[PDB]
Amino acid sequence: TVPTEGLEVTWGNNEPYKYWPQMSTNGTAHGHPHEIILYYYELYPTMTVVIVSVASFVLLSMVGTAVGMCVCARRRCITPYELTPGATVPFLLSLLCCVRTTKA
Amino acid sequence: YEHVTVIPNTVGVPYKTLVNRPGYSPMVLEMELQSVTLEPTLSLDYITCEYKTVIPSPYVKCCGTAECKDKSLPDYSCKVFTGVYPFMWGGAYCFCDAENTQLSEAHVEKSESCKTEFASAYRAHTASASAKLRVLYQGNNITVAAYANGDHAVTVKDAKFVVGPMSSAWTPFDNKIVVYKGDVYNMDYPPFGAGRPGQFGDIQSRTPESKDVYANTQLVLQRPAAGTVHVPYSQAPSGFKYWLKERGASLQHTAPFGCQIATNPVRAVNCAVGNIPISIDIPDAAFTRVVDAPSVTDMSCEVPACTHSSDFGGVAIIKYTASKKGKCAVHSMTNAVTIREADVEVEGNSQLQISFSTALASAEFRVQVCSTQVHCAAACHPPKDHIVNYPASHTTLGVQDISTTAMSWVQKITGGVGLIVAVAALILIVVLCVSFSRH
Numbered sequence: 138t139v140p141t142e143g144l145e146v147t148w149g150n151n152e153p154y155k156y157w158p159q160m161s162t163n164g165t166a167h168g169h170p171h172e173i174i175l176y177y178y179e180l181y182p183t184m185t186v187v188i189v190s191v192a193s194f195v196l197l198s199m200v201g202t203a204v205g206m207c208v209c210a211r212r213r214c215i216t217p218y219e220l221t222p223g224a225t226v227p228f229l230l231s232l233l234c235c236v237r238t239t240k241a
Numbered sequence: 242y243e244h245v246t247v248i249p250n251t252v253g254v255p256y257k258t259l260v261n262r263p264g265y266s267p268m269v270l271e272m273e274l275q276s277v278t279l280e281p282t283l284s285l286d287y288i289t290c291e292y293k294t295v296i297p298s299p300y301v302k303c304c305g306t307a308e309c310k311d312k313s314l315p316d317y318s319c320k321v322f323t324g325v326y327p328f329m330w331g332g333a334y335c336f337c338d339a340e341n342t343q344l345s346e347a348h349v350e351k352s353e354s355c356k357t358e359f360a361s362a363y364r365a366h367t368a369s370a371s372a373k374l375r376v377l378y379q380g381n382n383i384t385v386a387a388y389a390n391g392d393h394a395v396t397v398k399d400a401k402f403v404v405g406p407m408s409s410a411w412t413p414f415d416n417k418i419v420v421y422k423g424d425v426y427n428m429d430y431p432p433f434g435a436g437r438p439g440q441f442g443d444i445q446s447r448t449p450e451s452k453d454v455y456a457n458t459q460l461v462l463q464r465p466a467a468g469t470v471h472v473p474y475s476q477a478p479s480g481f482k483y484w485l486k487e488r489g490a491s492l493q494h495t496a497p498f499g500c501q502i503a504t505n506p507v508r509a510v511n512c513a514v515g516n517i518p519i520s521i522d523i524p525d526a527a528f529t530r531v532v533d534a535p536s537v538t539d540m541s542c543e544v545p546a547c548t549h550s551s552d553f554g555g556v557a558i559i560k561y562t563a564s565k566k567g568k569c570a571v572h573s574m575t576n577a578v579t580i581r582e583a584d585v586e587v588e589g590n591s592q593l594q595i596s597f598s599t600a601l602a603s604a605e606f607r608v609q610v611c612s613t614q615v616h617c618a619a620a621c622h623p624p625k626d627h628i629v630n631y632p633a634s635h636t637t638l639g640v641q642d643i644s645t646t647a648m649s650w651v652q653k654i655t656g657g658v659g660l661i662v663a664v665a666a667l668i669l670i671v672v673l674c675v676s677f678s679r680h
């Protein structure tokens with residue numbers, strides 16, 4: 138199994154033969170179907186691919202804080218209500234539908 | 242003019258270095274490493290070889306006794322025995338049945354074969370570097386040789402070259418080494434005068450010709466076989482000859498970076514480690530004023546096909562228009578791609594083809610010629626072979642790489658909803674600011 142930096146083999150008293158890797162495969166290809174994971178695996182395996190994993194979890198993190206803002210906006214919009222004595226939002230919950238739009 | 246550059250310590254890989262000088266046509270030189278030699282110090286610690294055991298004719302005696310007189314010889318030993326009744330062909334040597342005695346002694350000396358065959362232990366510590374370079378100058382390959390330590394300066398074709406010092410002080414050798422006729426071994430020999438029997442250094446000699454020697458062979462005698470005249474010896478087996486039997490792998494295989502090792506003198510050659518600084522003082526005679534060079538205009542580039550590989554798998558066709566016939570240099574200012582060719586003749590409104598090597602899946606780069614830039618965009622494809630014999634380090638690709646079309650994909654992925662969530666937070670906090678003042 139050749140390393141990225143090359144490998145040389147000596148056989149008998151004959152001059153040693155040197156083999157060093159070239160790019161791996163044609164299997165990867167750029168096109169409408171991504172097929173880039175094969176690019177970044179065949180070339181630099183385990184690198185620029187776990188990088189995709191960290192990108193995945195961080196994008197999950199931004200969407201998580203986004204749903205966090207969703208719930209925060211929900212509580213912030215219902216709080217001025219906080220069951221006011223008037224108990225009426227004909228133009229906000231009937232229209233904005235912030236939270237529990239079943240009622241009003 | 243003086244130009245300074247640095248190149249990776251590698252052999253057989255051409256390197257382009259573009260020296261530019263205002264008021265004159267910039268020129269790009271091709272430099273190649275033929276070989277780099279590392280000569281280590283030589284402090285001959287000592288030598289060793291097979292030993293010869295000298296045991297002169299034993300002293301026999303009857304009705305009387307012999308005696309041991311000390312001899313100032315290496316590992317000299319002696320012994321006496323009694324009651325021996327040796328017999329020869331014609332009968333008993335002598336009559337005294339048991340009153341007789343035998344004295345024996347022996348010593349060990351160096352062998353004349355040492356003058357031809359032997360193993361020598363040195364304590365080489367440091368080294369110096371010498372190297373061979375090939376340079377494309379004025380359209381011809383020129384060879385230069387110099388010490389790669391940043392000191393030796395060499396004049397060739399009116400230009401001054403200085404090479405080195407080696408960036409890395411690493412060596413494949415070791416403080417202590419042992420050399421056979423044509424083989425070298427990293428191995429800690431025992432200190433002189435303390436040779437362990439049956440191992441390397443069992444006999445120590447300062448030089449192949451020095452008469453003085455040191456030995457350690459436990460030469461113990463034994464009682465001779467009854468009824469016979471002879472000398473037995475418990476000569477220690479020679480550790481030197483034996484070490485030749487279990488030498489093991491030579492350093493030419495165990496050396497990291499595969500620095501080929503020679504002898505007479507001992508050198509380590511062709512190992513890629515670190516880089517080399519090169520300073521070239523080039524007389525202005527080679528330099529040509531920009532006005533001399535023909536102009537260039539109407540630059541178009543195209544790539545009928547390209548194939549990222551260790552070879553020059555990329556081909557680019559460029560349409561150009563120039564003022565007049567003349568030579569003009571060509572270069573790529575992006576390290577991610579290399580061009581085999583250095584310069585080319587340009588006649589005018591014509592075209593040309595160039596062979597280059599790259600590593601990017603999609604090759605998008607500028608090319609410089611006649612102090613002008615031309616873009617080039619193409620989509621290479623993977624070749625079929627996975628491993629090649631000849632070396633090629635030109636096409637080096639860092640962690641940064643072109644996602645090509647997929648780049649747009651990630652550019653599309655980068656879009657996030659943080660803007661809308663921040664907007665919602667701002668809206669809620671303000672509509673609260675009616676009651677939230679400064680907290």
Ligand SMILES: *[C@@H]1O[C@H](CO)[C@@H](O)[C@H](O)[C@H]1NC(C)=O
Nearest residue numbers: 375377378379380381382383
């Ligand atoms: C220089 O070396 C290259 C290596 O193959 C050879 O093709 C060329 O003819 C040599 N001479 C030059 C470039 O003048």
